[PDB]
Structure 1
Amino acid sequence: KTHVQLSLPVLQVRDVLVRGFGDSVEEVLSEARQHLKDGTCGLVEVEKGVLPQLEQPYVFIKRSDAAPHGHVMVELVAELEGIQYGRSGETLGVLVPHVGEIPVAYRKVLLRK
């Protein structure tokens, strides 16, 4: 399927144990997509002071359209030293590995895969 319905656990930035997916734009997009498939991906909501507490390159989910079955359609955009790889809509949050942190909420998304 071109899209997959996922429910992403929303993590508090100070709980996150593994603060990024790797060391290059290509690796972090690769790893984010693998963790999304494996159900091992969390979402951190972006506010003042969040991104400097996480590791670049960043992987964002961004709204790709204006929401089947309650799931917002999203795609992946990476960012390294202020340059984004991809073009999409409003940020829903920054993706991180999930290694058993307790979430505060779930974000239902339809991920363009």
Structure 2
Amino acid sequence: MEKTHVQLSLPVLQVRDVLVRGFGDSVEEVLSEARQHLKDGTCGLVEVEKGVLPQLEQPYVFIKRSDARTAPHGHVMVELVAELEGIQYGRSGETLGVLVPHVGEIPVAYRKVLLRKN
């Protein structure tokens, strides 16, 4: 019954503020935990720049652009892709950022996305 996509506004966090630097210890766990935190409204987004990924914990969960024409209501369509030891689980478009737990850190912006569930 889950709609295929959900409109979400994610808090954008600076990497040095992030208290919990990843979702888990395996590709399957991080994707599971990321989806659960997205559903609970406890997921943040870190924009990737030089120095960011080495300050976060692998496996990484990225949100990547899933199409070119869909940005309904200002929300870019995205899907989840995990990465561990240079191997990616999924193929998609450009990375919008890396997902991390949000535990109350103050964001610098909010990023509107239309997220593909599964």
TM range (shorter): over 0.9
Residue 3 of structure 1 and its aligned partner are, at CA, apart by 0.4
SS of aligned partner of 1:109: strand
Shift of 1:19: 0.1
Aligned residues, how many? 113
Give the deviation of 1:25 after TM superposition. 0.1
Tell me which residue corresponds to 2:110: 106
Q: Which runs of 4+ in 1 moved over 2 A?
A: none
Give, in whole Å, the separation in 1 of the partners of 2:41 and 2:23.
14
- Measured after TM superposition, the shift of residue 107 of structure 1 is 0.3
Q: Secondary structure at the match of 2:50?
A: coil
Once the two structures are TM-superposed, the CA of residue 24 in structure 1 deviates from its matched residue by: 0.1
Identity %: 100
Q: CA deviation at 1:18?
A: 0.1
CA distance in 2, matches of 1:64, 1:36: 17
- CA-to-aligned-CA distance 1:80-107 (integer Å, 9 cap, x gap): 0000000000000000000000000000
**TM (normalized to structure 2)?**
0.95
The CA deviation at 1:33 is 0.3
* 2:87 paired residue number: 83
> In the TM superposition, what whole-angstrom CA distance separates every residue of 1:42-95 from its partner, at most 9, and x where no partner exists?
000000000000000000000001111000000000000000000000000000
> Following the alignment from structure 1 to structure 2, what is the Cα–Cα distance between the partners of residues 69 and 91?
20
Post-superposition CA distance 1:12-59 (Å, at most 9, x none): 000000000000000000000000000000000000000000000000
**TM-score normalised per structure 1:** 1.00
Displacement of 1:6 in angstroms is 0.1
Q: 1:6 aligns with which of 8, 17, 39?
A: 8
Match of 1:57 among 47, 56, 59: 59
Distance 2:92 2:35 in 1: 17
* Structure 2 gap ranges (5+): none
